[PDB]
Design an enzyme around this catalytic site. Structure first.
Site, PDB file in Angstrom:
ATOM      1  N   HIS A 133       0.844  -1.228   0.000  1.00 58.83           N
ATOM      2  CA  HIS A 133       0.000   0.000   0.000  1.00 58.83           C
ATOM      3  C   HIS A 133       0.866   1.260   0.000  1.00 58.83           C
ATOM      4  O   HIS A 133       0.326   2.350  -0.256  1.00 58.83           O
ATOM      5  CB  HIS A 133      -0.935   0.035   1.225  1.00 58.83           C
ATOM      6  CG  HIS A 133      -1.951  -1.042   1.247  1.00 58.83           C
ATOM      7  ND1 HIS A 133      -2.795  -1.278   0.174  1.00 58.83           N
ATOM      8  CD2 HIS A 133      -2.267  -1.947   2.208  1.00 58.83           C
ATOM      9  CE1 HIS A 133      -3.620  -2.247   0.504  1.00 58.83           C
ATOM     10  NE2 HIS A 133      -3.284  -2.719   1.724  1.00 58.83           N
ATOM     11  N   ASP A 171      -2.358 -11.071  -1.932  1.00 57.02           N
ATOM     12  CA  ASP A 171      -2.985 -10.394  -0.777  1.00 57.02           C
ATOM     13  C   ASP A 171      -4.444 -10.057  -1.164  1.00 57.02           C
ATOM     14  O   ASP A 171      -4.697  -9.662  -2.312  1.00 57.02           O
ATOM     15  CB  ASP A 171      -2.146  -9.168  -0.387  1.00 57.02           C
ATOM     16  CG  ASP A 171      -2.616  -8.532   0.909  1.00 57.02           C
ATOM     17  OD1 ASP A 171      -3.672  -7.851   0.886  1.00 57.02           O
ATOM     18  OD2 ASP A 171      -1.874  -8.647   1.895  1.00 57.02           O
ATOM     19  N   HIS A 173      -6.151  -7.552  -0.471  1.00 54.29           N
ATOM     20  CA  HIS A 173      -6.238  -6.100  -0.760  1.00 54.29           C
ATOM     21  C   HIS A 173      -5.499  -5.758  -2.051  1.00 54.29           C
ATOM     22  O   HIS A 173      -4.457  -6.372  -2.354  1.00 54.29           O
ATOM     23  CB  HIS A 173      -5.687  -5.265   0.406  1.00 54.29           C
ATOM     24  CG  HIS A 173      -6.384  -5.551   1.705  1.00 54.29           C
ATOM     25  ND1 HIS A 173      -5.915  -6.465   2.599  1.00 54.29           N
ATOM     26  CD2 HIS A 173      -7.612  -5.166   2.144  1.00 54.29           C
ATOM     27  CE1 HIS A 173      -6.807  -6.594   3.601  1.00 54.29           C
ATOM     28  NE2 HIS A 173      -7.859  -5.769   3.347  1.00 54.29           N
ATOM     29  N   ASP A 264      -4.173 -13.006   3.672  1.00 49.40           N
ATOM     30  CA  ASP A 264      -5.423 -12.503   4.273  1.00 49.40           C
ATOM     31  C   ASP A 264      -6.626 -12.935   3.422  1.00 49.40           C
ATOM     32  O   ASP A 264      -7.732 -12.660   3.854  1.00 49.40           O
ATOM     33  CB  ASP A 264      -5.404 -11.009   4.571  1.00 49.40           C
ATOM     34  CG  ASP A 264      -4.690 -10.126   3.558  1.00 49.40           C
ATOM     35  OD1 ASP A 264      -4.311 -10.638   2.477  1.00 49.40           O
ATOM     36  OD2 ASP A 264      -4.565  -8.901   3.837  1.00 49.40           O
ATOM     37  N   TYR A 304      -3.563 -12.188   8.944  1.00 48.33           N
ATOM     38  CA  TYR A 304      -3.719 -11.796  10.364  1.00 48.33           C
ATOM     39  C   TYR A 304      -4.191 -12.976  11.227  1.00 48.33           C
ATOM     40  O   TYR A 304      -4.153 -12.849  12.438  1.00 48.33           O
ATOM     41  CB  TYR A 304      -4.569 -10.527  10.452  1.00 48.33           C
ATOM     42  CG  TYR A 304      -4.023  -9.474   9.529  1.00 48.33           C
ATOM     43  CD1 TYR A 304      -2.807  -8.872   9.785  1.00 48.33           C
ATOM     44  CD2 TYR A 304      -4.642  -9.222   8.309  1.00 48.33           C
ATOM     45  CE1 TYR A 304      -2.250  -7.962   8.900  1.00 48.33           C
ATOM     46  CE2 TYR A 304      -4.117  -8.301   7.421  1.00 48.33           C
ATOM     47  CZ  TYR A 304      -2.907  -7.682   7.710  1.00 48.33           C
ATOM     48  OH  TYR A 304      -2.366  -6.779   6.836  1.00 48.33           O
TER      49      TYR A 304
HETATM   50  N1  LIG Z   1      -2.777  -5.672   2.808  1.00 51.16           N
HETATM   51  N2  LIG Z   1      -3.551  -4.744   3.558  1.00 51.16           N
HETATM   52  C1  LIG Z   1      -4.113  -5.111   4.717  1.00 51.16           C
HETATM   53  O1  LIG Z   1      -3.974  -6.270   5.103  1.00 51.16           O
HETATM   54  C2  LIG Z   1      -4.960  -4.109   5.434  1.00 51.16           C
HETATM   55  C3  LIG Z   1      -6.047  -4.527   6.194  1.00 51.16           C
HETATM   56  C4  LIG Z   1      -6.872  -3.614   6.833  1.00 51.16           C
HETATM   57  C5  LIG Z   1      -6.624  -2.253   6.785  1.00 51.16           C
HETATM   58  C6  LIG Z   1      -7.504  -1.252   7.511  1.00 51.16           C
HETATM   59  N3  LIG Z   1      -7.821  -1.733   8.863  1.00 51.16           N
HETATM   60  C7  LIG Z   1      -7.230  -1.554  10.061  1.00 51.16           C
HETATM   61  C8  LIG Z   1      -7.952  -2.315  10.950  1.00 51.16           C
HETATM   62  C9  LIG Z   1      -7.809  -2.505  12.396  1.00 51.16           C
HETATM   63  C10 LIG Z   1      -8.357  -3.620  13.034  1.00 51.16           C
HETATM   64  C11 LIG Z   1      -8.239  -3.793  14.403  1.00 51.16           C
HETATM   65  C12 LIG Z   1      -7.592  -2.827  15.172  1.00 51.16           C
HETATM   66  N4  LIG Z   1      -7.408  -2.937  16.577  1.00 51.16           N
HETATM   67  C13 LIG Z   1      -8.177  -3.548  17.527  1.00 51.16           C
HETATM   68  N5  LIG Z   1      -7.783  -3.714  18.786  1.00 51.16           N
HETATM   69  C14 LIG Z   1      -8.954  -3.929  19.626  1.00 51.16           C
HETATM   70  C15 LIG Z   1     -10.018  -4.367  18.620  1.00 51.16           C
HETATM   71  N6  LIG Z   1      -9.391  -4.028  17.350  1.00 51.16           N
HETATM   72  C16 LIG Z   1      -7.080  -1.695  14.552  1.00 51.16           C
HETATM   73  C17 LIG Z   1      -7.173  -1.545  13.175  1.00 51.16           C
HETATM   74  N7  LIG Z   1      -8.950  -2.929  10.260  1.00 51.16           N
HETATM   75  N8  LIG Z   1      -8.859  -2.591   8.989  1.00 51.16           N
HETATM   76  C18 LIG Z   1      -5.518  -1.837   6.063  1.00 51.16           C
HETATM   77  C19 LIG Z   1      -4.707  -2.743   5.389  1.00 51.16           C
HETATM   78  K   LIG Z   2      -3.798  -8.215  -4.197  1.00 51.67           K
HETATM   79 ZN   LIG Z   3      -4.054  -7.355   2.832  1.00 55.27          ZN
END
Ligand SMILES: NNC(=O)c1ccc(Cn2cc(-c3ccc(N=C4NCCN4)cc3)nn2)cc1
Ligand SMILES: [K+]
Ligand SMILES: [Zn+2]
Ligand SMILES: [K+]
Length: 357
Positions: A133, A171, A173, A264, A304
Site C-alpha cells: 500500500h 494479498d 487487498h 489474508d 492476520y
Molecule cells: N494488505 N492490507 C491489509 O492487510 C490491510 C487490512 C486492513 C486495513 C484497515 N484496517 C485496520 C484495521 C484494524 C483492526 C483492528 C484494530 N485494533 C483492535 N484492537 C482492539 C479491537 N481491534 C485496529 C485496526 N482494520 N482494517 C488496512 C490494510
Molecule cells: K492483491
Molecule cells: Zn491485505
C-alpha cells in the site's frame, strides 16, 4: 535447486504502543518461522541474512520527503509518533518502525540478488512490516516502503534497466502503491487479485477495478482481478490463474517473479472474509514456479490469522523446495460473480495480449 529463506527476529520490534491487539502483530513472523521449524523446512533452506536497505535504495521508488519523515520517527517522542501515525490511512509507528521497514526491504534485496546470481533458485522472505500500500510519497495500510516495488527496481539496478519483473499480488487487498509506482512501465507487469466490492473494500478506490490497464507504454502491464459479492476460495483463484495470470505471465516472459504474498484471503482471516486453503496457496506457488526458469521470491504482505498464515506460507515454501502439490479436495463449482470478474478482465486485456484473443 536451492531455496533461500530470510527471517530476522529484529523485525518483531515494530509494534503498536497504544493498541497491543492491532492485527499486524510482531508474532506474525515468529509464528511463520516456528511452523517452518515444526515441518523441518528450515534446515532444507539456505539462510539468507537480513540487511538494512540504504536511503539510496529507498529512493528507487520513494520521494526524499517521505524517506526523511519516516526516518525521523526513530527519534520521536510518543506524542509525535501518535500524531505522525494520524497523518496516514491505517498506520501505527514506533521508534523501531523505520529500522524494521529497512530490514524488510534489505532482506528482499539480498534474496533477489541470491536468485539473480544463481546462488539460489527461489526464496521466501518472512518480513514485516508489509509493503504493497506504500506510495512514492506516503505510508498507508500498515506499509511504510513498498518492499516488492523496491525489490523489482533493485533487481533492475544489479542487472539491466529492462529486466522483466512480474509481481503477482495475491494479498486480499489491492496493492494501490505497487500499481501506481509501475503504472507507466512495461518492464514491470503488476497482476493483483483482490476483494473489491464495487470500490467499498480497503483501500476503497476505483483504481482497483479491471478497467485500469496501465498508462502510456504501460498499457496492458497492469492487471486488476477484482472480486465482488462472494466468499472466494480455491476454485476462483485456480480459474483466475488458468484464464488470466498464467497466459499473460507466459507471454510477458518474466526473468524474475516477485509474489506480494499476503495470506489474508485465507480461510480464518479476521479481515479478508475469503476461504483460500493452504493447499490452494501451494497450487498457486507451484504454477508460478513454471515461469522465469523458477526464479520466484515470495514476500510476506498481509494475513492476520496466526495459524492460517503459518500453515499457508509453510505450504508455499514446501512447493519452492520441490514437494508435490497436495490435492484440492472439496472444490465447490466456480461462483458466478467470479466468472463475471474473470470475463471482464479478459475483455479489458484481450487488446494487449495475443494469448487472450
Ligand atoms: N494488505 N492490507 C491489509 O492487510 C490491510 C487490512 C486492513 C486495513 C484497515 N484496517 C485496520 C484495521 C484494524 C483492526 C483492528 C484494530 N485494533 C483492535 N484492537 C482492539 C479491537 N481491534 C485496529 C485496526 N482494520 N482494517 C488496512 C490494510
Ligand atoms: K492483491
Ligand atoms: Zn491485505
Ligand atoms: K506496469
Amino acid at each position: 535447486p536451492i531455496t533461500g529463506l530470510v527471517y530476522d527476529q529484529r523485525m518483531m520490534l515494530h509494534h503498536n504502543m497504544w493498541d497491543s491487539h492491532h492485527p499486524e502483530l510482531p508474532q506474525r513472523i515468529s509464528r511463520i518461522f516456528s511452523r517452518h521449524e515444526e515441518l523441518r523446512l528450515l534446515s532444507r533452506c539456505h539462510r539468507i541474512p537480513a540487511r538494512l536497505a540504504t536511503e539510496e535504495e529507498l529512493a528507487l521508488c520513494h520521494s526524499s520527503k517521505h524517506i526523511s519523515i519516516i526516518k525521523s520517527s526513530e527519534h520521536m517522542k510518543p506524542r509525535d509518533l501518535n500524531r505522525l501515525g494520524d497523518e496516514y490511512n491505517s498506520i501505527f509507528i514506533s521508534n523501531e518502525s523505520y529500522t524494521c521497514a529497512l530490514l524488510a526491504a534489505g532482506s528482499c534485496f539480498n534474496s533477489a540478488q541470491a536468485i539473480l546470481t544463481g546462488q539460489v533458485r527461489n526464496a521466501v522472505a518472512i518480513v514485516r512490516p508489509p509493503g504493497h500500500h506504500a506510495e512514492k510519497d506516503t505510508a498507508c495500510g500498515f506499509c511504510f516502503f513498498n518492499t516488492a516495488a523496491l525489490t523489482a527496481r533493485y533487481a533492475q539496478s544489479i542487472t539491466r534497466e529492462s529486466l522483466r519483473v512480474l509481481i503477482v499480488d495475491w494479498d486480499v487487498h489491492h496493492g494501490n502503491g505497487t500499481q501506481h509506482i509501475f503504472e507507466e512501465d512495461d518492464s514491470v507487469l503488476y497482476i493483483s487479485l483482490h476483494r473489491y466490492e464495487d470500490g467499498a473494500f480497503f483501500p476503497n478506490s476505483e483504481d482497483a477495478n479491471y478497467d485500469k490497464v496501465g498508462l502510456g507504454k504501460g498499457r496492458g502491464y497492469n492487471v486488476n482481478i477484482p472480486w465482488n459479492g462472494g466468499k472466494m476460495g480455491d476454485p476462483e483463484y485456480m480459474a483466475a490463474f488458468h484464464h488470466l495470470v498464467m497466459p499473460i505471465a507466459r507471454e510477458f516472459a518474466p526473468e524474475l517473479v516477485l509474489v506480494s504474498a499476503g495470506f489474508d484471503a485465507a480461510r480464518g482471516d479476521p479481515l479478508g472474509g475469503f476461504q483460500v486453503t493452504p493447499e490452494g496457496y501451494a497450487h498457486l506457488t507451484h504454477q508460478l514456479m513454471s515461469l522465469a526458469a523458477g526464479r520466484v521470491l515470495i514476500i510476506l504482505e498481509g494475513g492476520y490469522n496466526l495459524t492460517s498464515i503459518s500453515e499457508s506460507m509453510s505450504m508455499c515454501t514446501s512447493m519452492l523446495l520441490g514437494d508435490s502439490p497436495p490435492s484440492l479436495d472439496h472444490l465447490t463449482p466456480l461462483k458466478t460473480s467470479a466468472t463475471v470478474s474473470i470475463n471482464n478482465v479478459l475483455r479489458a486485456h484481450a487488446p494487449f495480449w495475443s494469448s487472450l484473443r
